């Protein structure tokens, strides 16, 4: 009852996974060898074997060995089942077509066999949590190969998807716009709620709120995992107003294709400041509406809100939350659509946010994760399809994709389908 | 697991190669005997990328050593690391190439290539999953230029989908030792533009400019030049040998670095480089590594990048460093220097970050430039070729090997076609 | 009462036997000299002599001396009766016709004389356990000579048969397809339940679950014996739901010729992971439906299940098992036939799995052996009859078989009879 | 228990044989006196395969020693192990074969074969269960080629169902010591194609190529060549002398190795072979044994397997090793080299694995190739034969022994029929 299968794809998805499973082990009190010293709260994320060993409901997939061989050697080598850490011989080379058509074509029927052996251990599986990069070759091409299979094999089950998405200025690859636009069919047709996240927005959150001047990816992944702990907390714990994984979607998603919420977390705070701020429910609610805390570089004030899920956790009371959202409804800069007069879905859970002991993010009595469907996110799509247009007007890297079995027309068919999503988010604001 | 096969041709290719094998043996902690003596498990984790395991835990490097003379094999085999290589992998003739491309390609090396290629098979069949071929040679003289491009043609026909990756020391006017250098290079560049997936263009004039204007060496030898080349050879493969925050295979470089198929003539660099007497005064950090790496004095070809625009640059960093700081500096460079990058690509910089910096420095960066300024390297060879060829000078040494005058006309034709494709995106 | 005669044929059957008898001695507390320090639990597998020496109900047969001379010299030299370790002078040369017509023709009437002297010491003999290689000359040709005799001499008695079968890619012989196809008459006409096993599937189980990177045959045989201990455990021990050797067949076998179940065991696990997994009854049940744990390289999702025997052993309760199979019935990827609405035969036995002290496979409170009749196994036959077809189209090795007294037409008559079995398993799925 | 009878013919057969008896006596721990002095029970368990027990626990090897001259018997009897053999088993003439096949087969050895064959009976009647005959000879010269194939014919007629297994050193153009070598071999191959169950084709050109390009010996003798041959002779019988994870008798090899009756001309090899000064740098392990074993420089016949396809290969491994790792490498080879194996056989590799590696190495592999490339060995002998025979040169030395010109025509006819049957499956 209430299981989730977490699939971690490419380097970004696996490294976010290595932070997710670092957190879930602390939060459920599981040792890094999978044992538990001394309630079924762990059952959403861990299968339990008769030895008293808790084994994660996770699959890790990469087309090259390097990142998963590090998971197979570091402190979590004894946590995972050895055949659900899955590797190929050959890197996807930041090429969608190697991930989808040529290299991932070989590992896919082994990836599915592990997901089948995990689902057969569930009893009322709640959904899938799929972690990936939009810019990667494995991230875009292998996730889009896998999702097409899971959407015929498990058609009813909710597919939640956490995506590291290209930034306004920060980029690691020349072909990041091509891989991202080719992914837009995956999220539109074979996903149920897709959480876009941006490296440059978290880098700015780190600078302004944690006061860390120069963060690594370990600092980003420790924020991205904290949001998924808070999405899953109602599945795992007692609360005043627990939220089911489909109850979440029935309030987030107004229309079948309008399932790209923003996400934000509050308070992001260091130990230098957490002892001087009040961190009252009013303040951490208001922090979620600041452009300063959005984890995609777009401004919510250039949009309208369709719906917000305020998922509180720790020491909060429904009195305080209603009194808080009443001030948000009073502020004329936070504008909802005319057709959503209710606006807010509230969840409240009694389990505080767990600190990772090595981390920058401080101990606090309260947190909220706000997950928010808003028209503003269409600007993060308008940025990236303008990067695509400059390169496709030259066919600037297209021979690497055509050379690995892709149809040249798929680039036009993907830029077309993105323009129809960017149309849909502009159309519903009116 | 992504094995590489490495091949050395002529004097220069065997000299930059025999130094490269001393550098990556220091990294992987391998003794001159071939025994492992390193500190760390990470040194051993990917030792298969460049070596074969043999009995007693001795490691044998996957080099093939090719020459038309015994004297460079004798100089390598007797050298600092010479005893490491497999005796069967030294493949050689007796009478040299005479600094003649046509002896390399048609006579002296056409006899020998049947004995080379069948060793390249024994090493490639011993691989678990071969990613590519890493060939060291020079485009002047006759062995590296003419036999090495014969061998590229034979391995390309046999392994069409594996990465062909070449490190190519090539002529320039102010640092020259051969009369027929322009001919040999023009006949050789005609093979590189069609067959290789990447070619790293290296110049002795630029390698001497690093030694005088950066390192302040009073008397730089070929051993000092070979050390600069081999640092960038170790650099570009780092991400299949060590773990990192951003991994980049040689293919993940090629997909990002080569916009149009033939524009793969790269131009390498390395940082930090410091004057030997000055290190204690320098702060090693990402913005100083950047202000060295992207400056015209650091690149290992004579082309000043201020005479063109970059298509793509790859910066393969090594060491414990921030992704915000790397992503900040690789943004700040191409916005503050925006007139030097092509404006039909929305981001011109690839980044990669390995967790393991070279032995004895806290960080390092290997730079790979692709730039329209590489037109100047092909132009000056093409104009030296033209001024000899209008009077048919020296052609009896090449036509004596049964080569046509039509092959010179067709090589210089294909050279101007390569110049025109870089000048088109200027 | 409840005896079994175990016949170990050729190198594979004898070496699996040297693991079976290693296990049974530990599990019943019999020393390797056959003595027992300090209930009739041993009686299924051991005759007891008045000295207090327990002698195994086993026959070991090989046409060459080398492997049985090693059994006659190693730690078990004092366990076996010296005339039930039976050897010839001449190897069968991976030639079926030497095993069946020419060399085994001499040893057979001595092999039968030992089986008669064992059966005359039984009182209600339960059946035969016959261990062999499908690819061997002694494995195929001598087992098929012996079974034809036992099926006229002991016609009522159940003949259970454990076969090491050729793989998709892994092979040790050029003529392995010829010997296997010539064996298909033996299993169809003179066997009652035939457990196919594959070297390449166990090699992958070893890599993914035991984390042993490079296993020998000792690692395989220690898994193959563990399944037969679990098939026989209800014959040997107390349980909540003990299963008779014919009760097993009445639930496994829907039709007279449809007696080729898959087998799998869970948890296969090392001491690195067994202390971190839960190994609850739900997890070890679900592990049996993963393609990752099937000991033949075929995918059960490309078939339909006809019947499953879930044979649990150790600390389990019928509550937990019913609650587990209810989740298996809920999963749409695990598809049964329309005509088997019950699907599951459950056995539950109170004796945990015995560890061999030198072994890789860890101590655990629970195990299940799942033995499973499914249409999917026809693909392991479709692989091998496509290997046969390439060689018989050339008559590629046929002179070695015709030269040793075989009719050339038996190759056509065996490929024909295999096509009628591969027809029958496709016909009943509908 | 699967006894072998071993027979030595002419100078070469007695020299590769007298070295083989030093190798398997070291394995079985037998002293040059014939007394047992070994470590292990496994050495003694199968000592009957090659030896007879005699009084005082002295072991007498089951060799028959055949020559038409006393001087090789004198050289063996006086040699390192010469005192081991039975004095009655040295069967010899006085006047030699003159390097003439017809003296061997019709005159000088036709007199002697009645005295040989009746000793082969005393050894075969002393056997408990004979598995076969293991005959060492050369196809050049006259004793091994012409008397050895007379003796094969006589033993084949008397023992039709036992394995006839021959090790056959044979001519090649660049390493030759006889003018009439092509004649003698062509007359001899005509007997081997009909009578033997296996023939292991060995060449002095390939045995010198192993000594120079692998072992790096400066001056390889016939004693060094005889050591390479006898390692593969010890290799193929290993599985009836020692225990293993996969046992393979000489018949279990033949059933897997010989698809069509006459295609039994095998081509042996051995691993590990290392340059004497390089062993400490090599890792002894199954994938390095494989990358040596399957490479064209290691095989003991001049045929490059890249000029044909294999029908079957057998790899008889020895040592403590994984069956997954053996089965992985014997798969990886024939999938990555699939153009070099026939595609009407679905698996071309037989494997066997013995638990006991040779004294002083942790693992070893004996390789047996059957390949259509063996056409080149029969072709070059057939064309040397043809160029002499068109002018009837030297035929008075053979027709003087009462041989017909028709027998030369019929031998070269049967040679081209053997070339055509290998070229048919190309
Ligand atoms: C105390 C101290 O700071 O020592 C440094 C040093 O002084 C400097 C000047 C070193 C030094 O470099 C040279 O002297 C040099 C001379 C000609 C050509 C190239 C280098 C150094 O020798 C070089 C040496 O570098 C290495 O060992 C790297 O791992 C390098 N490998 C080798 O140089 C090498 C040498 C012998 C045998 C095998 C390898 C490497 C580079 C790229 C990829 C892999 C490995 C280092 C840190 C130093 C000294 C020792 C003074 C410098 O080189 C490097 C690669 O760091 C030159 O500019 C840098 C800055 C360093 O500060
Ligand atoms: C310390 C060390 O590593 O010693 C090795 C050694 O250095 C090397 C170079 C040995 C050595 O081989 C030779 O020198 C050699 C020369 C000409 C022709 C053939 C061999 C060695 O002599 C050979 C010797 O091998 C054996 O003894 C085998 O059991 C072999 N029998 C004999 O060679 C032998 C010698 C004298 C009397 C009787 C037998 C054998 C091979 C196949 C089947 C059965 C037995 C070994 C391990 C070594 C030395 C001693 C240096 C090598 O040979 C073998 C068979 O291992 C040559 O390449 C291998 C690799 C070894 O590393
Ligand atoms: N936050 C965060 N972002 C990461 C991390 N690792 C990679 N990224 C992002 O990943 C994006 C590019 O995708 P890749 O890392 O190349 O994805 P991949 O699936 O491994 O791609 P391939 O190597 O082609 O298979 C970049 O925009 C990075 O910023 C990580 O650990 N954390
Ligand atoms: N798991 C396992 N498989 C084995 C073992 N021994 C042999 N095999 C398998 O046996 C198959 C071939 O059969 P053989 O071993 O040649 O059978 P055999 O009866 O001894 O054949 P003959 O020698 O001709 O009499 C191969 O596919 C091997 O993988 C063992 O101990 N364990
Ligand atoms: N960097 C470097 N350049 C060399 C070396 N040896 C020669 N060169 C230079 O580059 C050219 C190489 O040509 P060479 O290798 O001699 O021709 P080849 O032997 O016929 O291939 C020469 O003219 C030299 O200027 C060396 O050790 N290192
Ligand atoms: N390997 C090996 N080859 C030999 C030896 N002696 C001779 N040979 C070579 O092989 C041929 C053998 O012929 P030989 O044995 O002299 O003829 P025979 O005495 O009449 O049978 C010679 O021409 C030599 O080239 C030896 O000891 N070892
Ligand atoms: Mg990747
Ligand atoms: Mg057998």
- CA A166-A168-A172 angle, to 5 degrees, is 50
C204 contacts in D (CB within 8 Å)? none
Q: How far is B129 from chain A (nearest CA, A)?
A: 7
In this structure, which ligand is nearest to the CA of D242? Answer: 2
Between the CA of A208 and the centroid of ligand 8 the distance, in Å, is: 74
**Residue A164 corresponds to which tokens in the numbers above?**
């590291």
Secondary structure (DSSP) of D14-74: HHHHHHHHHHHHHHTTB-TTSBB--S-HHHHHTGGGTEEEEGGGEEEE-EEEEESSSHHHH
Between the CA of B246 and the centroid of ligand 3 the distance, in Å, is: 7
Q: Is the dihedral of CA C80, C86, C90, C94 positive or negative?
A: negative
Separation between Cα atoms, residue C375 and residue C385, nearest integer Å = 17
In this structure, which ligand is nearest to the CA of A179? Answer: 3
Experimentally, the structure was elucidated by cryo-EM
Residues with CB under 6 Å of ligand 1 are B 22-23, 26-27, 215, 224, 227-228, 231, 234, 272-274, 276, 279, 358-361
Residues with CB under 6 Å of ligand 4 are C 10-12, 15, 63, 91-94, 133, 135-139, 164, 172-173, 199, 217, 220-221; D 252
**Closest to A220 measured CA to CA, from A175, A146, A170, A281:** A170
Contact by Cβ (8 Å): B54, D281: yes
Q: How far is D320 from chain C (nearest CA, A)?
A: 9
Contact by Cβ (8 Å): C284, C361: no
**Closest to D361 measured CA to CA, from D413, D284, D424:** D284
- To the question of whether residue D400 is assigned a binding role by annotation, the answer is no
From A49, A82, A123, residue closest to C208, measured CB to CB: A82
Judged by DSSP in three states, C129 sits in: strand
Residue A12 Cβ inside 6 Å of ligand 3? The answer reads yes
Separation between Cα atoms, residue C165 and residue C136, nearest integer Å = 10
Cross-chain residue pair C172–D350, CB shorter than 8 Å: yes
Residue ranges of E strands in D255-322: 265-271, 310-319
Cross-chain residue pair A91–B347, CB shorter than 8 Å: no
Contact by Cβ (8 Å): B86, D283: no
Bin D64: left if φ > 0, else alpha if -120 < ψ < 50, else beta.
Answer: beta
Nearest residue by C-alpha to atom 13 in ligand 3: A136
Closest ligand 4 atom to C140 CA: 19
Q: How far is D321 from chain C (nearest CA, A)?
A: 7
Judged by DSSP in three states, D390 sits in: coil
In this structure, which ligand is nearest to the CA of A11? Answer: 3
Closest ligand 5 atom to B175 CA: 25
Separation between Cα atoms, residue A293 and residue A313, nearest integer Å = 18
Q: How far is C18 from chain D (nearest CA, A)?
A: 13
Between the CA of B165 and the centroid of ligand 7 the distance, in Å, is: 21
Longest dimension (CA), chain B: 61
Between the CA of B227 and the centroid of ligand 1 the distance, in Å, is: 9
Between the CA of B2 and the centroid of ligand 7 the distance, in Å, is: 14
Residue A63 Cβ inside 6 Å of ligand 3? The answer reads yes
Task: Give A211's contacts (C-beta < 8 A, 6+ positions apart).
Answer: A270, A272, A273
**Catalytic amino acids of C?**
247
Work out how many CB contacts closer than 8 A connect C with D.
112
Q: How far apart are the first and last CA of chain D?
A: 39
The reported resolution of this PDB entry, expressed in Å, is 23.0
Which of A247, A277, A290, A427 is labelled catalytic? A247
Between the CA of A384 and the centroid of ligand 3 the distance, in Å, is: 17
CA neighbours closer than 13 Å in the CB half-sphere of residue A376: 26
Distances (CA, A) of C130 to C230, C273, C428, D272: 16, 34, 27, 40
Residue B5 Cβ inside 6 Å of ligand 5? The answer reads no
In degrees and rounded to multiples of 5, residue D40 shows phi and psi of: -125, 145
Distances (CA, A) of A164 to A10, A19, A161, A176, B252: 11, 14, 10, 11, 19
Residue D288 Cβ inside 6 Å of ligand 2? The answer reads no
All partners of chain B with 3 or more CB pairs under 8 angstroms: A, D
B49 contacts in A (CB within 8 Å)? none
Bin B238: left if φ > 0, else alpha if -120 < ψ < 50, else beta.
Answer: alpha
Helix residue ranges per DSSP H, A297-393: 318-330, 378-392
> What's the full length of chain C, in residues?
430
- To the question of whether residue A15 is assigned a binding role by annotation, the answer is yes
Separation between Cα atoms, residue A342 and residue C74, nearest integer Å = 81
**Closest to B252 measured CA to CA, from B165, B363, B382, B364:** B165
Separation between Cα atoms, residue B382 and residue B388, nearest integer Å = 10
Contact by Cβ (8 Å): D426, D303: no
Pairing of strands D130-138, D163-170: parallel
Cross-chain residue pair B125–D295, CB shorter than 8 Å: yes
Considering only residues 218 to 247 of chain B, which have any Cβ-Cβ distance to chain A shorter than 8 Å?
239-240, 243-247
Cross-chain residue pair D283–B126, CB shorter than 8 Å: no
Work out how many CB contacts closer than 8 A connect B with D.
88
Query: Is some CB atom of chain C closer than 8 A to the CB atom of A33?
Result: yes
From B60, B123, B125, residue closest to D282, measured CB to CB: B60
Cross-chain residue pair B350–A172, CB shorter than 8 Å: yes
- To the question of whether residue A137 is assigned a binding role by annotation, the answer is yes
Residue B179 Cβ inside 6 Å of ligand 5? The answer reads no
A70 contacts in B (CB within 8 Å)? 243
Q: How far is D306 from chain B (nearest CA, A)?
A: 9
Q: Is the link from the previous residue into B272 a cis peptide, with omega within 30 of 0? A: yes
Separation between Cα atoms, residue B115 and residue B90, nearest integer Å = 10
Contact by Cβ (8 Å): B394, B183: yes
From A174, A207, A399, residue closest to B348, measured CB to CB: A174
Residue D127 Cβ inside 6 Å of ligand 6? The answer reads no
- To the question of whether residue C229 is assigned a binding role by annotation, the answer is no
Chains D and B touch (3+ CB pairs under 8 A): yes
From A93, A173, A203, residue closest to B324, measured CB to CB: A203
Residue found under tokens 């228990």: D1
**Closest to A371 measured CA to CA, from A390, A351, A346:** A346
B331 contacts in A (CB within 8 Å)? 169-170
Sheet containing strand B130-138, strands side by side = B90-92, B63-67, B3-9, B130-138, B163-170, B198-203, B265-271, B363-371, B310-319, B349-354, B244-246
Cross-chain residue pair D331–C91, CB shorter than 8 Å: no
- CA B67-B69-B72 angle, to 5 degrees, is 70
> What's the full length of chain B, in residues?
426
CA-nearest residue of chain A to B345? A391
D297 contacts in B (CB within 8 Å)? 88, 118, 122
Residue ranges of E strands in B109-162: 130-138
Pairing of strands B59-61, D58-61: unpaired
Separation between Cα atoms, residue D233 and residue D23, nearest integer Å = 9
Secondary structure (DSSP) of C367-422: EEEEEEEEGGGHHHHHHHHHHHHHHHTTTTTTHHHHTTT--THHHHHHHHHHHHHH
Distances (CA, A) of D51 to A380, D86, D382: 85, 11, 39
CA-nearest residue of chain A to B323? A216
């Amino acid at each position: 009852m209430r299981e989730c299968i977490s699939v971690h794809v490419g380097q970004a998805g696996v490294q976010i996974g290595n932070s997710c499973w670092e957190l879930y082990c602390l939060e459920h009190g599981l040792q890094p060898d999978g044992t538990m010293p001394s309630d079924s709260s762990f059952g959403t994320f861990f299968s339990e074997t008769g030895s008293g060993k808790h084994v994660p409901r996770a699959v890790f997939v990469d087309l090259e060995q390097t990142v998963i061989g590090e998971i197979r050697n570091g402190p979590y080598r004894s946590l995972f089942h050895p055949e659900q850490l899955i590797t190929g011989k050959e890197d996807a080379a930041n090429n969608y077509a190697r991930g989808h058509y040529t290299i991932g074509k070989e590992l896919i029927d082994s990836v599915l066999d592990r997901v089948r052996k995990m689902a057969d251990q569930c009893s009322g599986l709640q959904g899938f949590l799929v972690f990936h990069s939009f810019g990667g070759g494995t991230g875009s091409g292998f996730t889009s190969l896998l999702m097409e299979r899971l959407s015929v094999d498990y058609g009813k089950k909710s597919k939640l998807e956490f995506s590291v998405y290209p930034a306004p200025r920060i980029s690691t690859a020349v072909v990041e716009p091509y891989n991202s636009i080719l992914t837009t069919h995956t999220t539109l047709e074979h996903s149920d709620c897709a959480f876009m996240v941006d490296n440059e927005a978290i880098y700015d959150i780190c600078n302004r709120n944690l006061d860390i001047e120069r963060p690594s990816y370990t600092n980003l992944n420790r924020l991205i995992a904290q949001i998924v702990s808070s999405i899953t907390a109602s599945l795992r714990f007692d609360g005043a107003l627990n939220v089911d994984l489909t109850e979440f979607q029935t309030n987030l998603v107004p229309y079948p294709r309008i399932h790209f919420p923003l996400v934000t977390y509050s308070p992001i705070i260091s130990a230098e400041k957490a002892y001087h701020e009040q961190l009252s429910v009013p303040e951490i609610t208001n922090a979620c509406f600041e452009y300063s805390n959005q984890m995609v570089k777009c401004d919510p004030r250039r949009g309208k809100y369709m719906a917000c899920c305020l998922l509180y956790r720790g020491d909060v009371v429904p009195k305080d939350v209603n009194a808080a959202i009443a001030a948000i409804k009073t502020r004329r800069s936070i504008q909802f659509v005319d057709w959503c007069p209710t606006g807010f879905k509230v969840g409240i859970n009694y389990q505080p946010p767990t600190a990772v002991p090595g981390g920058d993010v401080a101990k606090v009595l309260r947190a909220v994760c706000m997950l928010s469907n808003t028209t503003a996110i269409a600007e993060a799509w308008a940025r990236l399809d303008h990067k695509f247009d400059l390169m496709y007007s030259k066919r600037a890297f297209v021979h690497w994709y055509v050379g690995e079995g892709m149809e040249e027309g798929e680039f036009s068919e993907a830029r077309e389908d993105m323009a129809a999503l960017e149309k849909d988010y502009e159309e519903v604001g009116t | 697991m992504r094995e590489i096969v490495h091949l050395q041709a002529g004097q220069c290719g065997n000299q930059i190669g025999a130094k490269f094998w001393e550098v990556i043996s220091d990294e992987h902690g391998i003794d001159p005997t071939g025994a492992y003596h390193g500190d760390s498990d990470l040194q051993l984790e990917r030792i298969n990328v460049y070596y074969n395991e043999a009995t007693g835990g001795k490691y044998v490097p996957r080099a093939v050593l090719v020459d038309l003379e015994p004297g460079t094999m004798d100089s390598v085999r007797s050298g600092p690391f010479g005893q490491i290589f497999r005796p069967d992998n030294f493949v050689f003739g007796q009478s040299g190439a005479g600094n003649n491309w046509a002896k390399g390609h048609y006579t002296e090396g056409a006899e020998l290539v049947d004995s080379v290629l069948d060793v390249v098979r024994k090493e490639a069949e011993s691989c678990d999953c071969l990613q590519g071929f890493q060939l060291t040679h020079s485009l002047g003289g006759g062995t590296g230029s003419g036999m090495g491009t014969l061998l590229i043609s034979k391995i390309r026909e046999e392994y069409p989908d594996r990465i062909m990756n070449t490190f190519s020391v090539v002529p320039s006017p102010k640092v020259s030792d051969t009369v027929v250098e322009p001919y040999n290079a023009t006949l050789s560049v005609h093979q590189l533009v069609e067959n290789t997936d990447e070619t790293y263009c290296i110049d002795n004039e630029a390698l001497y400019d690093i030694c005088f204007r950066t390192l302040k060496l009073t008397t730089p030898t070929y051993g000092d030049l070979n050390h600069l080349v081999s640092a960038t050879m170790s650099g570009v493969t780092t991400c299949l040998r060590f773990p990192g925050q951003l991994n980049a295979d040689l293919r993940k470089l090629a997909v990002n670095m080569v916009p149009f198929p033939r524009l793969h003539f790269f131009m390498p660099g390395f940082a930090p480089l410091t004057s030997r007497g000055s290190q204690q005064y320098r702060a090693l950090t990402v913005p100083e590594l950047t202000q060295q790496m992207f400056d015209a004095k650091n690149m290992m070809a004579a082309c000043d990048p201020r005479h063109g625009r970059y298509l793509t640059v790859a910066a393969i960093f090594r060491g414990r460093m921030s992704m915000k700081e790397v992503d900040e500096q690789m943004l700040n460079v191409q916005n503050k220097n925006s007139s030097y990058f092509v404006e039909w690509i929305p981001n011109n910089v690839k980044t990669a970050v390995c967790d393991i910096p070279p032995r004895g420095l806290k960080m390092s960066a290997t730079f790979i430039g692709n730039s329209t300024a590489i037109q100047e390297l092909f132009k000056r060879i093409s104009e030296q070729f033209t001024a000899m060829f209008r009077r048919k000078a020296f052609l009896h040494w090449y036509t004596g090997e049964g080569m046509d005058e039509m092959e010179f006309t067709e090589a210089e034709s294909n050279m101007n076609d390569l110049v025109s494709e870089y000048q088109q995106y200027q």
